Write a protein that binds this ligand. Structure first.
Ligand SMILES: Nc1ncnc2c1ncn2[C@@H]1O[C@H](COP(=O)(O)O)[C@@H](O)[C@H]1O
Ligand SMILES: [Mg+2]
Lengths: 150, 8, 151
C-alpha cells in the first residue's frame, strides 16, 4: 500500500501543479519535530485527510479558508488560515510577499518544512532551517519534498 | 457567533 | 452538542450560499448506512464547520460537485453521487441535486438538504417528504425538529 508520507507528497505536487499556473496563493507548513501547536491554535480546525482536491479547494481565493497557513501534522490538515511569524530580516526583498515572510519566519523558529505558491507570480518556494529555495519547478519542488520526508 | 473575513 | 454544532454549521453555510445561489447537496447518515454512496466520493473525514462547508461548495472547484456526506459528526466525504429518483419532471427551480436528494431518501433514512444552483432555494428530503423552498428560519427549525431529540 502507498505510504501516508508518499500519498502526502503526491497530494502536494498535484495541488501546486493546479495552483501555480493560476497564480493562486498557497502557504502550507508541515510540522516535523518541533511542535507547531502555537500556530495551530490560531487557525480554523479541519483535522482532514490530505488530498490534492481539498488543498486546491482550501486556497481558492475569496473563500473562508484561503488566507494564511495550512498546517500539516501526523499526515492530516490540522488547520487552515493559521498565522505564522513574519520574518524581520530586511533582506527579504520585494517580489516575495506575506506568505513568503511567514514561511521564512517559521523556519527561523522551527524545523518545519513550509512551501509557498506566489499569489502574483505563481512561483513555487520552500523553506527549511533558515534556507529559502524559491522559483522551483514542479520537478524541483517535488524532489526537494522527497529528501526531507525520506 | 458570526463569520468574519472579507471574503464576505 | 454534536447535533447542535452540526445544525449551526449547516445554517451559517446555507446563509452564505443561499443568496449567492451556490449549489449545495448535504446528506446526513442517520440509522441506515449510506456507505454505498460514501464510497463514490473524495474522503475528507473532516470536522464539520461552516467555513469548510462553504469552501467545499464554491463553484467550479474540485470538491463542489456531488454530495457532502455527514457521518457521525464528521464530513465523511465530498463529491458523492446519490441514486436519482425515477421522476425528473423538474422544470425550473428544481434540478438534479434535488433529484438525487429524493432518490436517496427513497432508499434510506438520511436527512438531505439542497441549496438550488438556480434560485438559492432551500430544500429538505426526509422520510417520504420533500419540503422545498424554505426560509433560513424554516430550514433551521426542520433541522432541529429532525436532528435533536425532543427539545
Ligand atoms: N446522482 C447525483 N448525486 C449527487 N449530485 C449530483 C448527481 N447528479 C448530478 N448531481 C449534481 O448536480 C449537478 C448538475 O447536474 P445536471 O444533470 O444539471 C452536477 O454537477 C452534480 O454536482
Ligand atoms: Mg443544468
Amino acid at each position: 500500500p502507498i505510504s501516508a508520507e508518499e500519498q502526502m507528497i503526491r497530494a502536494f505536487v498535484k495541488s501546486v501543479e493546479y495552483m501555480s499556473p493560476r497564480k493562486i496563493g498557497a502557504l502550507v507548513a508541515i510540522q516535523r519535530v518541533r511542535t507547531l501547536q502555537e500556530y495551530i491554535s490560531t487557525g480554523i480546525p479541519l483535522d482532514a485527510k490530505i488530498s490534492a482536491e481539498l488543498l486546491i479547494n482550501i486556497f481558492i481565493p475569496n473563500t473562508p479558508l484561503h488566507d494564511g497557513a495550512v498546517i500539516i501534522k501526523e499526515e492530516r490538515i490540522a488547520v487552515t488560515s493559521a498565522y505564522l511569524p513574519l520574518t524581520k530580516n530586511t533582506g527579504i526583498s520585494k517580489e516575495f510577499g506575506t506568505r513568503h515572510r511567514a514561511a521564512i519566519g517559521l523556519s527561523e523558529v522551527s524545523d518545519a518544512l513550509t512551501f509557498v505558491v506566489s499569489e502574483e507570480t505563481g512561483g513555487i518556494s520552500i523553506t527549511y532551517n533558515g534556507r529559502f529555495k524559491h522559483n522551483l519547478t514542479l520537478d524541483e519542488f517535488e524532489t526537494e519534498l522527497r529528501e526531507i520526508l525520506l | 457567533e458570526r463569520l468574519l473575513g472579507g471574503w464576505k
